[model samples]
Target: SDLGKKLLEAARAGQDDEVRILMANGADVNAEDTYGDTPLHLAARVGHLEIVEVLLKNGADVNALDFSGSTPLHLAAKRGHLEIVEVLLKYGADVNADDTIGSTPLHLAADTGHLEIVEVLLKYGADVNAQDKFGKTAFDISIDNGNEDLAEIL
Candidate 1:
């Protein structure tokens, strides 16, 4: 929906005011754009904590996914946005939601060796043993990515 596109743009542009205005004007907070990206996705991808907060307040779906099946939590963890990940989790994002490739937010956090994200996800109930499309768990993918420390954390 174009609402999602507008929200995405607002997020990417850091237009917090516009985001709020759009929401007030009946924008679909959970609408996904062409790439299946929600407003939360764009905010997390761009590391916009304030925008993330605003969108979430407007009822954005924290677990919304893009074409790759990656949720906002996935994008946040992958990009090392610990605070954003925390906010998403608090808003009910699924810590264990997986991508088309079967990669969870924990998988991305582990692969990137982001210990903070790993701890946060674990604290929020992420399943470390969750397997990916290749039958490899987050621990396995972390090891494959040479992030043995992350594997250990998992």
Candidate 2:
């Protein structure tokens, strides 16, 4: 349990070497922390691209969600980490992965006004008209947030 916890801490801290060592010694790549966040989740949330790559290489689920049902793609898109998003996509992240509230990666990107993220998501086949549980599409969020440029692109 300590090693699992340390693996998570290493991921959160972006300690790529520690991550590799822990994994090599049998730390579960998909081991969830107390908050249900796997190493991949923390790595993506903090924009630790190298850590993310290590986790994925060690067999972390690309679409793994936290307790809130937010995937690595969701966090990466929400945080506007273009390189992380790209790497996640390369590793087969679900571009339309939904959070607990049904917000997709596209929704988060559009809401945050990350035009490039939105574009990349679209290029990867994100549904432009997909709606959340509240029936709010990414385009609607862009309009509500006065992201006119993003709204137009959506």
Candidate 3:
């Protein structure tokens, strides 16, 4: 639906007022656009904390999976959005959910060199031993990405 597309656009652009307005005018808060990306996914991907919270409060799925099996937490952690990651985790996001290629939020954070996000994920119980598609664990990915400190953190 175009309404879902509109909603996704608002979320991705961090259009806070439009997001709420669209929802108020009957746009589904949990609506997904192409690639199976929900409003929450777009908001999380763009690091829009307010939109993420509003969407969550409006009945968005905290653990909604997109085409790649990536959740909002996965996007947030992957992009180093610490606050969004924490908020998603607090809202019951799965800390250890693996994507289509088997990368969890921890695995993404490690590979992306987001040290703080890595710490937060670990604090929230991310699995250090989880492996990705290439049989690489989070620690292995950190080492492979030339982030030895992240490997140590993992």
**lDDT for each candidate structure:** 0.85, 0.91, 0.91
Q: Give the per-residue lDDT digits (tens) of candidate 3, residues 1-154.
A: 7677899999999999999899988898878886998999998998999999999999899999898899999999989899999899999999999999999999888888999999989998999999888899999887778887887778
| True-structure RMSD, every candidate | 1.7, 0.9, 1.0
lDDT of 1 by residue, 67-115 (tens): 9998899999999999999998999999889899888888888877889
Q: State the lDDT of candidate 2 residue by residue for 47-111, as single tens digits.
A: 99999988888889999878899999999899999999999999999988888889999999998
Q: How many residue pairs clash per model? A: 0, 0, 0
Give model 3's TM-score versus the native structure. 0.96
Model 1 scores a TM of: 0.90
Model 3, CA-based lDDT: 0.91
Error of 3 at 77 (Å): 0.9
Q: Estimate each model's TM-score.
A: 0.90, 0.96, 0.96
lDDT of 2 at 67: 87
- Name every residue pair that clashes in candidate 1: none
Q: Model 2, which residues run further than 4 Å from truth?
A: none
Error of 3 at 32 (Å): 1.0
Sort all candidates by lDDT, best to worst.
2, 3, 1
